[PDB]
Design an enzyme around this catalytic site. Structure first.
Site, PDB file in Angstrom:
ATOM      1  N   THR A  80      -7.203 -34.849  46.242  1.00  0.00           N
ATOM      2  CA  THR A  80      -8.584 -34.476  46.553  1.00  0.00           C
ATOM      3  C   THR A  80      -9.388 -35.631  47.095  1.00  0.00           C
ATOM      4  O   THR A  80      -9.288 -36.755  46.634  1.00  0.00           O
ATOM      5  CB  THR A  80      -9.274 -33.873  45.277  1.00  0.00           C
ATOM      6  OG1 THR A  80      -8.559 -32.668  44.956  1.00  0.00           O
ATOM      7  CG2 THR A  80     -10.710 -33.627  45.481  1.00  0.00           C
TER       8      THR A  80
HETATM    9 CL   LIG Z   1      -8.188 -36.066  42.528  1.00  0.00          CL
END
Ligand SMILES: [Cl-]
Ligand SMILES: [Cl-]
Ligand SMILES: [Cl-]
Ligand SMILES: [Cl-]
Ligand SMILES: [Cl-]
Ligand SMILES: [Cl-]
Ligand SMILES: [Cl-]
Ligand SMILES: [Cl-]
Ligand SMILES: [Cl-]
Ligand SMILES: [Cl-]
Ligand SMILES: [Cl-]
Ligand SMILES: [Cl-]
Ligand SMILES: [Cl-]
Ligand SMILES: [Cl-]
Ligand SMILES: [Cl-]
Ligand SMILES: [Cl-]
Ligand SMILES: [Cl-]
Ligand SMILES: [Cl-]
Ligand SMILES: [Cl-]
Ligand SMILES: [K+]
Ligand SMILES: [K+]
Ligand SMILES: [Mg+2]
Ligand SMILES: [Mg+2]
Ligand SMILES: [Mg+2]
Lengths: 239, 200, 196, 234, 233, 202, 213, 216, 248
Positions: free
Chosen positions: F1
Site C-alpha cells: 500500500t
Molecule cells: Cl502497508
C-alpha cells in the site's frame, strides 16, 4: 397516596416527588446569571447561618471545566454531587473527543443524568437547580439552566431560588446584549441586594464569578477588589 | 536440608539439620526446621524455605482455630490432612515443600509425610530433603520400634550427622525433638563440628 | 510404580494392588493401600499422580456414601462406575483434570460380580480381568493364557500369584508386597498379603 | 409521616425527614469543640461514661499525621467514616508522597456521605465530625453533617447543649487567631464547660484534647495528660 | 412497617434500639477488672433438670489471654465469637504477637451495623445482633474488661453487668468495686451479686466463672473450684 | 500500500494505490483505500484490511452520532482523535496505519497521521503504507509551501506513481480525492493517465 | 519478552549489639555497566526503633518500602501503638509471600531494638523466609562481607580468643572496613557508605566516602 | 506496549541555581527511519514542573493526556494547593510501576524537572518504576555520551549558573548528534525557574567536520 | 420496594404459609385426579376440563405426562405451572441417567422436584407453583409405585389416592373398596370408574370426560399407555351393568 415515588404518576399526570424536589430549590436563597456582550456573570445571595463560619464556606459557585462555571440553588450536597458529575462529563469528553466540551452539550448531558433520577422508586430526584456559563470566541457567551426534572434551556438572564421572580423582573430592565461583564457585575450585585430580605434573613455574603473575553474564556471568581466595588455600588443604590 | 522422624515405643523422634542455601551459597547455619505447631504437634521443613515456613505457620493458625471451635486437640491425621488440602490447590505452580507432621493423639504416636506434590502418607519412619538418602541408610540400619530412648536420640543424631557429611546442601547443627504422650520436648542442639570430634 | 489387578469369577471379584509408595529412588512406605471402600460391595483401586489419586478417590467415596445416606440403599457397581466416569470425563477439559487410572470392583445382588477398567481419559470398559501400571505389560498375557470365566477363587489366587511372581522375576521395580481382597455376596474380605 | 421513613421520599415542603432525624443523632451526642489560631487547630471533647466504673467513650481519633477528628452521634458510623478518611490519606501519600490537603479530604467526605441519601433502602450517616488539620494553607476546622453538607469554620461545637459552646466561641473568636497554644486550648475548654450542668466540672476523667499545628503532628491528650491544660483555668 | 435502616425522630435506628431490648431477655453476666486479672461470671438459667448444664456455654475462650461472656440471643453470638477467634489468629499469623483486648473488641464491633437490604451480597445480614458481650483478658496494657452492645459501641469498664438484672447488679458493683481490689475479692463479689439477682438458688452447676491473669491463661472454673468459692457465699 | 494526503489553502488532497495482497497474490487490484468518515472527512487506510475496515466503520458510527448530538459538522481533529483512541487502546491487536484528512469550518484543511502504535500528529503532508519508504526522498525534495489544489493533486499522483513502480505491495490505479468547503471531488488515474518515468536503459 | 526486573546493585549490612543496632548500605545505584546516581541510600527509617535495608531491583525497593510505610500506619491506627521490630519482621514475611508467584526482587535486612532494648537483626529472602541473626550482609557484595563478619564477629575458625561483647566502636570499625573491602572488588558497591545507629536515644547517621570508580 | 513503534531518543536534564533545564530532540524514529521530524518530546505539566520523555511516543501522548487532565482537575478546585514536581514524579513512579506489574508497560524513560519553594527538582522514572533524583540526568544514549560530561563539570563546580547549564546542555546535544544514530539536529530546551516553564525551539547545534580530511 | 412486596415467603402468626394454603385451595377446585396401585401395575384417572365441542384433540392426553421410560404423572391445578414442573421432572430424570446410566428411582425424582417447590416457600419472594401431582412408576428397588406431592414441597407414597375436585369423598370410597395386596389392574380400573362416577356429581359420566393411563411391565420393559375411548366406554358400560346387579 400518589406522591411517594418518582415512578408513580398522579391521576392528573404529575410526578409529585419531582415537584417536591423543586420546592427545596425554591426555599433556597437566590442565585442569578446574566449573559452579556462578552461573557456570563453569576451572583449568589449566600446566607450566612453562623458567624462561626469562614468567609467562602459553602460556596455555591463552582468551576466544572476550565471554561465552565456552575451556580447552584437547593440542597447543597445534591448540588456538589452534580458539580462532580459535570466535571466527570467534561473530563471524559476531552479524553474521548480531544477538545473542550461545548456548553450546550455539557448542559444536555448533565440534564439527562438529573432526568434519570425522576423515573424510579429506587432513587430520588436531585433537590437542586443549577446554571452553567461559558464563553469562547467561537461559541460566544452561553448561559443554561437545569432544574430537578432535567429540563435544560438557554437564557439571556436567569434566577433560581426564593426571590426568583423579583430577580427576573430586575434583570429584564437591563439591556444585557450590549453590556460588558465589567458593567454587568455591578448590576448583578445590585439585584442580589434588591431581592434580599434584610428583615427575615440577617446576613449574607455576595458570591460572584464570571467567564468572558476579559478572563480569556476561563471561569474565575470575580477579583476581591471588583466584588467590593460592586457591593458598595449595590448598597448605595439601595439608599 | 536433611530431616527425619520415626515412631517407636516411647513416641516420635524428630530431627533436622540447620543449613539454608541460595543456590550453592550457604545463607544460614542456624535455621530452625522443626516448627512447634502446638505443645503436642511438630512440623518439619524441607524444600523452599519461604514455602515451608509460610504453609506450616498457616497450618498452625488453622489447628488453633480448630481447637477453639471444637474444644479438643486436632488429631495428627486431621492436621496432616488440612496441610495436604491447602497445598493441593497449588499443584503445578512451583511450590516446593516436604514435611513430616509428628504428634501423639488418641491413636497414639502419629507421623505423616506431606508434600507439595500432593502426597500424604502415614508411616513408621521417614526422611526428607536433599540429604534424605544418606539419613535413610543410617536410620534404616539402626531402627527398631523397641529402641530405648537414649538409643533413639543417638540414632537420629547420627543419621542427620552422616547426611551432613555426604550432602553439600545439609549442615550446621542437628536439632532433635522427642514427642511424648504429654507433649514434645526439645532434646538437644549439637553443632556438626562438635559431633565430628566426638564420633572420631 | 503402581500396580493394580482384578480378576472376576462367576460369583466374586478378586483384586490386588502393590503396597509401595515411592519417591525418586526410594520406597517411602511398604504397607501402602491403594484400595478405597465405596460401599459394602464396592472397591475403587486408584493409581496415578500424587494428590489427584487420593483427592479423586475420596471425593467419589464420599459421594457414594452420601447417596446411601440420602436414599436408604447403595449405588450398584455399574452405577458407581458410570458416576466415577462422568466425574472424570467432566473434569478432563476443565481447569482441574485428575490424572488417575482406576479399577472398580463390585458385587451386585442381581447382576453378580463386576470389574471395570478406567484410564485417565475416562474411557470405561467392563472386563473379565484387567490391570494397570507398567506391571500390566508383563502380567496381562499370563491372565489371557490361564483365565477362564468359571475360574474358582482358590485357582484365581493361584493365578494372581503367578502374575505377582512374574513381577518379582522380570519387572525392574522392587514391588515386594501386595494387598489382596475379594468381593462377593457377603461383601469385602481381606485376604493375606502376598509377599516376597 | 408517610414522608418520614425513606431517605428517598421528599416531603411536600421540600424536606427529607430521614436526614433531619439523622441529625438528631448528633444533637444527642456529648458536646465537642473545635477552634483554630494562625498556627494550631484544637479539638476538645466531653466523654460520656455509661456507669461510674466505665472509662469514658473515646471522642477523638487519629486520621493522619496532619489530621484528627472529634465525633458526635453513632459511634459505628464514626468509625466507618474515620476508616474512609484514613484510607484516603494513605492513598494520597502512596501516590503523591505528600499529605492530602484537608479541604480535599472534606470534599471526599461530602461526596461519599451524599450517596446513600439518594438511594432506596440506604440511610444517612448518623454522625457529625469536627475535623482539625494543618496543611500548606495553615490550620483548619471543618464540620461534617449527616446531610453530607460540610462547613469551613473559625470554630465550632456540635452535640448536646452545644448552643452554649457556640455562643462562647462567637463571643471570643476575634481573639483566636493571635492566641498561643495554651490560650487557645483554654478557650476550647471554657467553651466546652458552658455545655455542662452548673454543678459539674471538667475533670481528667471527662475531657479529651486533640492538637495539630505547624510544629506538631496530630496528638491526643487523655486522663493524666489533660491536667496541664486544666490547671490554670485561672 | 419501614426499612431496617430507618431512623426514629430521636436519631436512633429502630432495629438497634430493639436489639438492645433483646439483651434484657438474657441471663445476667458480670465482669470485673482487677490489677491481678479479670473474672467473668454468668448465670446459666437452667430451665429443666433434664438439660445438661455443661451444654450451656455463655463464657468462651477467644484466645489464651482473652475470654468472652455473652447475654441476649445466644445463637446470634456465634458468628461474633468466631470472628473474634479468627481475628486473633490472623493477628498472630501476620504479626507474631497477641492481639490486644481492645483491638479484638474493635474488630468484632465493626460488624455491628453491617445489616440492610439493598447495599449488600445476595444474602447479607438482615438485622443487627441481639447480643451484648464482655471481653475480659490480659495484654501489655495489663488486665482488661471491655463491653460491647448491638450498636457497635464498645468501651473499657472496671466492672460491668449485662442481661436481665444488670440494673441491680451494676448498683451492687459500684458499691463493692475499688481499684486496689484483689482478684479473689472480685470473684466473691460477683458470686454474691449473682446470688442476689438470680431467681434460682445459686449452686456450682447453674453458674459459670472464668478468669484470666497476668500469670496464667484463660481458665474456666471446674465444679470443684466453684464449690470451694461458693462455701463463703 | 501507499497512501498520502496533502494540505492546501482551503482543503486537502488524499490519494492511494489500489493493490490488496495476500502474500504475493493480488486479491484486489482496484481497492478503494480512501474511506469517507463524514461529509468532508476521509481516512486513507494501510495495514490489515480487516482491521482498518473495522476501525473505520466504528469511527464512522461514533462520529456520526456525535455530529447529530452536537448539530454541527464534526472537526477533523475529532475524527483523528477517535481513530487515535481506538488505534492506541488496541495497539496490541491491530495493524493499522491511518491518515485522516478533511475540511471543517473552524480549522480548514487538515491532515493527521495515526501510524501504528496509535500516536497522532498533524502534518502539512503525510505518507504511509509499505510503499512510502520509497518516496521519502522524493516528497522531501518536491514539497513546496503554498501549493495550489491542482499542484497538490499532481504532487500526490507523482509520488504515488513512483511508490507503485518500486513496491511490489502497491499498484493498480491511483485514487484521488480533494476535499474543500464546496465538497469532495473524487477521481481515478488509470493506465496511461498514471505519471510515467522511464526505466533507465543503457 | 519485556522483562519486569532489572538489577540495580547495592550492598546492605546489619549488626546487633547488646544495646544497639547498625544498618548500613552503600549509596550507588547502578544499571548494566552504568551508574544512575551516586547518592541513593538503601536504608529506610520505619520507627524510632527500626530501620530496614533494601537492595535488588530498585522499582520493587521503592514500592515495598511505601507499602511497609502505609501498613505501619494502618497498624498504629487499629492497635493504638507503634509496631515492634519483631512485628514488622513477621509482617514483611507475609507481604513478601503475597508476591510468591511474582516476587519483589528485594533482599531485606531489618535492624532495630527488640522489646527488652537489645539489638535485633532480621534477614529475609525475596519471598519472605526469615530469621533473627546477630549480624547479616545482603545484596551485591554479601558473599564478600559475610565470611569476614562470621570470622570477626562470630569468632569462627579462631582458637584461643576470648568471645567478648561487641562494642559499638569495634562494630563501626568493622562496618567501614568491610565496605571498603567490598568497594575494591564488587563493581556495584561504591561512592559512599551510609551508617544508621539505632539506640534508646534514637537513630543517628554517619557517612563515609568510598571509591568512585 | 509490548513493541515500541515510533520512539524518541535521549532526554537530558541538569540543575542550576534557580531552576532546571531539560533538552530533547524533536524526532520520532520508526526503527532506523527518521520519520516525524518536528514533534515535541517535552510537556509543561504545570507552572513548577516539566517532563521530557524517551521511548514510545504514543505512550508519551497518553501520559500527557492523563497528566494534563489531572492538573486541570486540580485547578478547578481553586484551593491553594498544587502538585509539586516531587508529587508529579511520585505519581509517575506509581503509574509506571503499576503498568510494569500488569506486564503491560508504558514504554518510556522520563525526566521530570521543576522548581518550587526555592528548590530545584530533577527526577528520573523508567518503564519499570525505577526512580530517583540527581543533579543531572540523561536517558538512552545520553547515559553513555552526555552524563559523563555533565558529571565531570558538576564535580568541579556543583552549582552552575543558568547560562553555564544551558551551554553544557548544548555541548551534550552536539555530542549526541555526532554519536547516536537515532538523533536529530533540531531540539528543544525547556527551563523552569521561579517565573515558570519556558520551552524554546526549534534549536540546532553548530557541528564540525574537519576530521573528514584527517584520514590517510 | 417494601410497599408493594406482598411477602410470599414469610410465616403468618400461627406458623402458617398462606400462599401455600391458598395454592392448595386452587388445586381443590381443579379436575379430579386419582391414582391406584395394583399387583400387576399402576393407573391414573383424571377428569378432563378440556371438554367444549369445538376443541381439536391433538395430543395423546390433556393432563397425563410421560416423565421418562419408567414413569408418568398427572396434575391438578394451574396448567401453565404444571408445564414448568413436568419439564423440570424430565430434565432431572435425564440428569440422573446421564450421570449413573440407570433410570432415576421414582422416589428420588419426586423428592428432587419437591425440593424445588420447598425453596419457593422459603426464599425468593415468588408465588409458589399451584400444582399437586400424582406420579406412577416402576423401579428395580420398590417395583410399582404411586406418589403424591403438593405445593408445600411435601410428598408421600400411596396405594391409592386423589387430588383435585371432591378429593375427600374420593379417598373415602377408596378407603372402603381398595383391597391391600389383592388389587389387579382390571379391578383398580373398575374402582377408578366407580370413584369418578360418584365424584363427578356435575354430571352423568362419559368417556369424552375422563382420561386413563396404565403403567405395566412386559418382558423386562415398562409400558405406559393412555386408554383409547373404546376401552373407556367399555369400562363405563361394565360399571353400569355392575350397578344393575346391586340389589338382586
Ligand atoms: Cl502497508
Ligand atoms: Cl427556582
Ligand atoms: Cl540451630
Ligand atoms: Cl475448624
Ligand atoms: Cl497412609
Ligand atoms: Cl531439600
Ligand atoms: Cl457522641
Ligand atoms: Cl452509637
Ligand atoms: Cl446541613
Ligand atoms: Cl449539634
Ligand atoms: Cl444489659
Ligand atoms: Cl481494504
Ligand atoms: Cl504506520
Ligand atoms: Cl502508515
Ligand atoms: Cl494492483
Ligand atoms: Cl513531525
Ligand atoms: Cl506542553
Ligand atoms: Cl428415559
Ligand atoms: Cl430413564
Ligand atoms: K508495484
Ligand atoms: K566498586
Ligand atoms: Mg493438576
Ligand atoms: Mg486481528
Ligand atoms: Mg568504573
Amino acid at each position: 397516596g400518589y406522591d411517594l415515588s418518582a415512578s408513580t404518576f398522579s391521576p392528573d399526570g404529575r410526578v409529585f416527588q419531582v415537584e417536591y424536589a423543586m420546592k427545596a430549590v425554591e426555599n433556597s436563597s437566590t442565585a442569578i446569571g446574566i449573559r452579556c456582550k462578552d461573557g456570563v456573570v453569576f451572583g449568589v445571595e449566600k446566607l450566612v447561618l453562623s458567624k462561626l463560619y469562614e468567609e467562602g464556606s459553602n460556596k455555591r459557585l463552582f468551576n466544572v471545566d476550565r471554561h465552565v462555571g456552575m451556580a447552584v440553588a437547593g440542597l447543597l450536597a445534591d448540588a456538589r454531587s452534580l458539580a462532580d458529575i459535570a466535571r466527570e462529563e467534561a473530563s471524559n469528553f476531552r479524553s474521548n473527543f480531544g477538545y473542550n466540551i461545548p456548553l450546550k452539550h455539557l448542559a444536555d448531558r448533565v440534564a439527562m443524568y438529573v432526568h434519570a433520577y425522576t423515573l424510579y422508586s429506587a432513587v430520588r430526584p436531585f433537590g437542586c437547580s443549577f446554571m452553567l456559563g461559558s464563553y469562547s470566541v467561537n461559541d460566544g457567551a452561553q448561559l443554561y439552566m437545569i432544574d430537578p426534572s432535567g429540563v435544560s434551556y438557554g437564557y439571556w438572564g436567569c434566577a433560581i431560588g426564593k426571590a426568583r421572580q423579583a430577580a427576573k423582573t430586575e434583570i429584564e430592565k437591563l439591556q444585557m446584549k450590549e453590556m460588558t461583564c465589567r458593567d454587568i457585575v455591578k448590576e448583578v450585585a445590585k439585584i442580589i441586594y434588591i431581592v434580599h430580605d434584610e428583615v427575615k434573613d440577617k446576613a449574607f455574603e455576595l458570591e460572584l464569578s464570571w467567564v468572558g473575553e476579559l478572563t480569556n474564556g476561563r471561569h474565575e471568581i470575580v477579583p476581591k477588589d471588583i466584588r467590593e466595588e460592586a457591593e458598595k455600588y449595590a448598597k448605595e443604590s439601595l439608599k | 536440608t536433611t530431616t527425619l522422624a520415626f515412631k517407636f515405643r516411647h513416641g516420635v523422634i524428630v530431627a533436622a539439620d540447620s543449613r539454608a542455601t541460595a543456590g550453592a551459597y550457604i545463607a544460614s547455619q542456624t535455621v530452625k526446621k522443626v516448627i512447634e505447631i502446638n505443645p503436642y504437634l511438630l512440623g518439619t521443613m524441607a524444600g523452599g524455605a519461604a514455602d515451608c515456613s509460610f504453609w506450616e505457620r498457616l497450618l498452625a493458625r488453622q489447628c488453633r482455630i480448630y481447637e477453639l471451635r471444637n474444644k479438643e486437640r486436632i488429631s495428627v491425621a486431621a492436621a496432616s490432612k488440612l496441610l495436604a488440602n491447602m497445598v493441593y490447590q497449588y499443584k503445578g505452580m512451583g511450590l516446593s515443600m516436604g514435611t513430616m507432621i509428628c504428634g501423639w493423639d488418641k491413636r497414639g504416636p502419629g507421623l505423616y509425610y506431606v508434600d507439595s506434590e500432593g502426597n500424604r502418607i502415614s508411616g513408621a519412619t521417614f526422611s526428607v530433603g536433599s540429604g534424605s538418602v544418606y539419613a535413610y541408610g543410617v536410620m534404616d540400619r539402626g531402627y527398631s520400634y523397641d529402641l530405648e530412648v537414649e538409643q533413639a536420640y543417638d540414632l537420629a543424631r547420627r543419621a542427620i550427622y552422616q547426611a551432613t557429611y555426604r550432602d553439600a546442601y545439609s549442615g550446621g547443627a542437628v536439632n532433635l525433638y522427642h514427642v511424648r504422650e504429654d507433649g514434645w520436648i526439645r532434646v538437644s542442639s549439637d553443632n556438626v563440628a562438635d559431633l565430628h570430634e566426638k564420633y572420631s | 510404580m503402581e500396580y493394580l489387578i482384578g480378576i472376576q469369577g462367576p460369583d466374586y471379584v478378586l483384586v490386588a494392588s502393590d503396597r509401595v509408595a515411592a519417591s525418586n529412588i526410594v520406597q517411602m512406605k511398604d504397607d501402602h493401600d491403594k484400595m478405597f471402600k465405596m460401599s459394602e460391595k464396592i472397591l475403587l483401586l486408584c493409581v496415578g499422580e500424587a494428590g489427584d489419586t487420593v483427592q479423586f478417590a475420596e471425593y467419589i467415596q464420599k459421594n457414594v456414601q452420601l447417596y446411601k445416606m440420602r436414599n436408604g440403599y447403595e449405588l450398584s457397581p455399574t452405577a458407581a462406575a458410570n458416576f466415577t466416569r462422568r466425574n472424570l470425563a467432566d473434569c478432563l477439559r476443565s481447569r482441574t483434570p485428575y490424572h488417575v487410572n482406576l479399577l472398580l470392583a463390585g458385587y451386585d445382588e442381581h447382576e453378580g460380580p463386576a470389574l471395570y477398567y478406567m484410564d485417565y481419559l475416562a474411557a470405561l470398559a467392563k472386563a473379565p480381568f484387567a490391570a494397570h501400571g507398567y506391571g500390566a505389560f508383563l502380567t496381562l498375557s499370563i491372565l489371557d493364557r490361564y483365565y477362564t470365566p468359571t475360574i474358582s477363587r482358590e485357582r484365581a489366587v493361584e493365578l494372581l500369584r503367578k502374575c505377582l511372581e512374574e513381577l518379582q522375576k522380570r519387572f525392574i521395580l522392587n514391588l515386594p508386597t501386595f494387598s489382596v481382597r475379594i468381593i462377593d455376596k457377603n461383601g469385602i474380605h481381606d485376604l493375606d498379603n502376598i509377599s516376597f | 409521616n408517610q414522608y418520614d421513613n425513606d431517605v428517598t421520599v421528599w416531603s411536600p415542603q421540600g424536606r427529607i425527614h430521614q436526614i433531619e432525624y439523622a441529625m438528631e443523632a448528633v444533637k444527642q451526642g456529648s458536646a465537642t469543640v473545635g477552634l483554630k489560631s494562625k498556627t494550631h487547630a484544637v479539638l476538645v471533647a466531653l466523654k460520656r461514661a455509661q456507669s461510674e466504673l466505665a472509662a469514658h467513650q473515646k471522642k477523638i481519633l487519629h486520621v493522619d499525621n496532619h489530621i484528627g477528628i472529634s465525633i458526635a452521634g453513632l459511634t459505628a458510623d464514626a468509625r466507618l467514616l474515620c476508616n474512609f478518611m484514613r484510607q484516603e490519606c494513605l492513598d494520597s501519600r502512596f501516590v503523591f508522597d505528600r499529605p492530602l490537603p484537608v479541604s480535599r479530604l472534606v470534599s471526599l467526605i461530602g461526596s461519599k456521605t451524599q450517596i446513600p441519601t439518594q438511594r432506596y433502602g440506604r440511610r444517612p450517616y448518623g454522625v457529625g465530625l469536627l475535623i482539625a488539620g494543618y496543611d500548606d494553607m495553615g490550620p483548619h476546622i471543618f464540620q461534617t453533617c449527616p446531610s453530607a453538607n460540610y462547613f469551613d469554620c473559625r470554630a465550632m461545637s456540635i452535640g448536646a447543649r452545644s448552643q452554649s459552646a457556640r455562643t462562647y466561641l462567637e463571643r471570643h473568636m476575634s481573639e483566636f487567631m493571635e492566641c498561643n497554644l495554651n490560650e487557645l486550648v483554654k478557650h476550647g475548654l471554657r467553651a466546652l464547660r458552658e455545655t455542662l450542668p452548673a454543678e459539674q466540672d471538667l475533670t481528667t476523667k471527662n475531657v479529651s484534647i486533640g492538637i495539630v499545628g505547624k510544629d506538631l503532628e496530630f496528638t491526643i491528650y487523655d486522663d493524666d495528660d489533660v491536667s496541664p491544660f486544666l490547671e490554670g483555668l485561672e | 412497617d419501614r426499612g431496617v435502616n430507618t431512623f426514629s425522630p430521636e436519631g436512633r435506628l429502630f432495629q438497634v434500639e430493639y436489639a438492645i431490648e433483646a439483651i434484657k431477655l438474657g441471663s445476667t453476666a458480670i465482669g470485673i477488672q482487677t490489677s491481678e486479672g479479670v473474672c467473668l461470671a454468668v448465670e446459666k438459667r437452667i430451665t429443666s433438670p433434664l438439660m445438661e448444664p455443661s451444654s450451656i456455654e455463655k463464657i468462651v475462650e477467644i484466645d489464651a489471654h482473652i475470654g468472652c461472656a455473652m447475654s441476649g440471643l445466644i445463637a446470634d453470638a456465634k458468628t461474633l465469637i468466631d470472628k473474634a477467634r479468627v481475628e486473633t489468629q490472623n493477628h498472630w499469623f501476620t504479626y507474631n504477637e497477641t492481639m490486644t483486648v481492645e483491638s479484638v473488641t474493635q474488630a468484632v464491633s465493626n460488624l455491628a451495623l453491617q445489616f440492610g437490604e439493598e447495599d449488600a451480597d445476595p444474602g447479607a445480614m438482615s438485622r443487627p445482633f441481639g447480643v451484648a458481650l464482655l471481653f475480659g483478658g490480659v495484654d501489655e496494657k495489663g488486665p482488661q474488661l471491655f463491653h460491647m452492645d448491638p450498636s457497635g459501641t464498645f468501651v473499657q469498664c472496671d466492672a460491668r453487668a449485662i442481661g436481665s438484672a444488670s440494673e441491680g447488679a451494676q448498683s451492687s458493683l459500684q458499691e463493692v468495686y475499688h481499684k486496689s481490689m484483689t482478684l479473689k475479692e472480685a470473684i466473691k463479689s460477683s458470686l454474691i451479686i449473682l446470688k442476689q439477682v438470680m431467681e434460682e438458688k445459686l449452686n456450682a452447676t447453674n453458674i459459670e466463672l472464668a478468669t484470666v491473669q497476668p500469670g496464667q491463661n484463660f481458665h474456666m472454673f471446674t465444679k470443684e473450684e466453684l464449690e470451694e468459692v461458693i462455701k463463703d457465699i | 500500500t501507499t497512501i498520502m494526503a496533502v494540505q492546501f489553502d482551503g482543503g486537502v488532497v488524499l490519494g492511494a494505490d489500489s493493490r490488496t495482497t495476500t502474500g504475493s497474490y493480488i486479491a484486489n487490484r482496484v481497492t478503494d483505500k480512501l474511506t469517507p468518515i463524514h461529509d468532508r472527512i476521509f481516512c486513507c487506510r494501510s495495514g490489515s484490511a480487516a482491521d482498518t475496515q473495522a476501525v473505520a466503520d466504528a469511527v464512522t458510527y461514533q462520529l456520526g452520532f456525535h455530529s447529530i448530538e452536537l448539530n454541527e459538522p464534526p472537526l477533523v481533529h475529532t475524527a483523528a482523535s477517535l481513530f487515535k483512541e481506538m488505534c492506541y487502546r488496541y495497539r496490541e491487536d491491530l495493524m493499522a496505519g491511518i491518515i485522516i484528512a478533511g475540511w471543517d469550518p473552524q480549522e480548514g484543511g487538515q491532515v493527521y497521521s495515526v501510524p501504528m502504535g496509535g500516536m497522532m500528529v498533524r502534518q502539512s503532508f503525510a505518507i504511509g503504507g509499505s510503499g512510502s519508504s520509497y518516496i521519502y526522498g522524493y516528497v522531501d525534495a518536491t514539497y513546496r509551501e503554498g501549493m495550489t489544489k491542482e499542484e497538490c493533486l499532481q504532487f500526490t499522483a507523482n509520488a504515488l506513481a513512483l511508490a507503485m513502480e518500486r513496491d511490489g505491495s502497491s499498484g493498480g490505479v491511483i485514487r484521488l480525492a480533494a476535499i474543500a468547503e464546496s465538497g469532495v471531488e473524487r477521481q481515478v488515474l488509470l493506465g496511461d493517465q498514471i505519471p510515467k518515468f522511464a526505466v533507465a536503459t543503457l | 519478552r519485556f522483562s519486569p526486573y532489572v538489577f540495580n546493585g547495592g550492598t546492605i549490612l546489619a549488626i546487633a549489639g547488646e544495646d544497639f543496632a547498625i544498618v548500613a548500605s552503600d549509596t550507588r545505584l547502578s544499571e548494566g555497566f552504568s551508574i544512575h546516581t551516586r547518592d541513593s541510600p538503601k536504608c529506610y527509617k520505619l520507627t524510632d526503633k527500626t530501620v530496614i535495608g533494601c537492595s535488588g531491583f530498585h522499582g520493587d525497593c521503592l514500592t515495598l518500602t511505601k507499602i511497609i510505610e502505609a501498613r505501619l500506619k494502618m497498624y498504629k491506627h487499629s492497635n493504638n501503638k507503634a509496631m515492634t521490630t519483631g512485628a514488622i519482621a513477621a509482617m514483611l514475611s507475609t507481604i513478601l509471600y503475597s508476591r510468591r508467584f511474582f516476587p519483589y526482587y528485594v533482599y531485606n535486612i531489618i535492624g532495630g531494638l527488640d522489646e527488652e532494648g537489645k539489638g535485633a537483626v532480621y534477614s529475609f529472602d525475596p519471598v519472605g523466609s526469615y530469621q533473627r541473626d546477630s549480624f547479616k550482609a545482603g545484596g551485591s557484595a554479601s558473599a564478600m562481607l559475610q565470611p569476614l563478619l562470621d570470622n570477626q564477629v562470630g569468632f569462627k575458625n579462631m582458637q584461643n580468643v576470648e568471645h567478648v561483647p561487641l562494642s559499638l566502636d569495634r562494630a563501626m570499625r568493622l562496618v567501614k572496613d568491610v565496605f571498603i573491602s567490598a568497594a575494591e572488588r564488587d563493581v556495584y558497591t561504591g561512592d559512599a557508605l551510609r551508617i544508621c545507629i539505632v539506640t534508646k536515644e534514637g537513630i543517628r547517621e554517619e557517612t563515609v566516602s568510598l571509591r568512585k570508580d | 506496549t509490548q513493541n515500541p513503534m515510533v520512539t524518541g531518543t535521549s532526554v537530558l536534564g541538569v540543575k542550576f541555581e534557580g531552576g532546571v533545564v531539560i533538552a530533547a530532540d524533536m524526532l520520532g524514529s520508526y526503527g532506523s527511519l527518521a520519520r516525524f521530524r518536528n514533534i515535541s518530546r517535552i510537556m509543561r505539566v504545570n507552572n513548577s514542573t516539566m517532563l521530557g520523555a524517551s521511548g514510545d511516543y504514543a505512550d508519551f501522548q497518553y501520559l500527557k493526556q492523563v497528566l494534563g487532565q489531572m492538573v486541570i482537575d486540580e485547578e478547578l478546585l481553586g484551593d491553594g494547593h498544587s502538585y509539586s514536581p516531587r508529587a508529579i514524579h511520585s505519581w509517575l513512579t506509581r503509574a509506571m510501576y503499576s503498568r510494569r506489574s500488569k506486564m503491560n508497560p508504558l514504554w518510556n524513560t522520563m525526566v521530570i524537572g521543576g522548581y518550587a519553594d526555592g528548590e530545584s527538582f530533577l527526577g528520573y522514572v523508567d518503564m519499570l518504576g525505577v526512580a530517583y533524583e540527581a543533579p543531572s540526568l540523561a536517558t538512552g544514549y545520553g547515559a553513555y555520551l552526555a552524563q559523563p560530561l555533565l558529571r565531570e563539570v558538576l564535580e568541579k563546580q556543583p552549582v552552575l549558573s543558568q547560562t553555564e547549564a544551558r551551554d553544557l546542555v548544548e555541548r551534550c546535544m552536539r555530542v549526541l548528534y555526532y554519536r547516536d544514530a537515532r538523533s536529530y539536529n533540531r531540539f528543544q530546551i525547556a527551563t523552569v525557574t521561579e517565573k515558570g516553564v519556558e520551552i524554546e525551539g526549534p534549536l540546532s547545534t553548530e557541528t564540525n567536520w574537519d576530521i573528514a580530511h584527517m584520514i590517510s | 420496594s417494601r410497599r408493594y412486596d406482598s411477602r410470599t415467603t414469610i410465616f403468618s402468626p400461627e406458623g402458617r404459609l398462606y400462599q401455600v394454603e391458598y395454592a392448595m385451595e386452587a388445586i381443590g377446585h381443579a379436575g379430579t385426579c386419582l391414582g391406584i396401585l395394583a399387583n400387576d401395575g399402576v393407573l391414573l384417572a383424571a377428569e378432563r376440563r378440556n371438554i367444549h365441542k369445538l376443541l381439536d384433540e391433538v395430543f395423546f392426553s390433556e393432563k397425563i405426562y410421560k416423565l421418562n421410560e419408567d414413569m408418568a404423572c398427572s396434575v391438578a391445578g394451574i396448567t401453565s405451572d404444571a408445564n414448568v414442573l413436568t419439564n423440570e421432572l424430565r430434565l432431572i430424570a435425564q440428569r440422573y441417567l446421564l450421570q449413573y446410566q440407570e433410570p432415576i428411582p421414582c422416589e428420588q425424582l419426586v423428592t428432587a422436584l419437591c425440593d424445588i417447590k420447598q425453596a419457593y416457600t422459603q426464599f425468593g419472594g415468588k408465588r409458589p407453583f399451584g400444582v399437586s401431582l400424582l406420579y406412577i412408576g416402576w423401579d428395580k428397588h420398590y417395583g410399582f409405585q404411586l406418589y403424591q406431592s403438593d405445593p408445600s414441597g411435601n410428598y408421600g407414597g400411596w396405594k391409592a389416592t386423589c387430588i383435585g375436585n371432591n378429593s375427600a369423598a374420593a379417598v373415602s370410597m377408596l378407603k372402603q373398596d381398595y383391597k391391600e395386596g389383592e388389587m389387579t389392574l382390571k379391578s383398580a380400573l373398575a374402582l377408578a370408574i366407580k370413584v369418578l362416577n360418584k365424584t363427578m356429581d356435575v354430571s352423568k359420566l362419559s368417556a369424552e370426560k375422563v382420561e386413563i393411563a396404565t403403567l405395566t411391565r412386559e418382558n423386562g420393559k415398562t409400558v405406559i399407555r393412555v386408554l383409547k375411548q373404546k376401552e373407556v366406554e367399555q369400562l363405563i358400560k361394565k360399571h353400569e351393568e355392575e350397578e344393575a346387579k346391586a340389589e338382586r
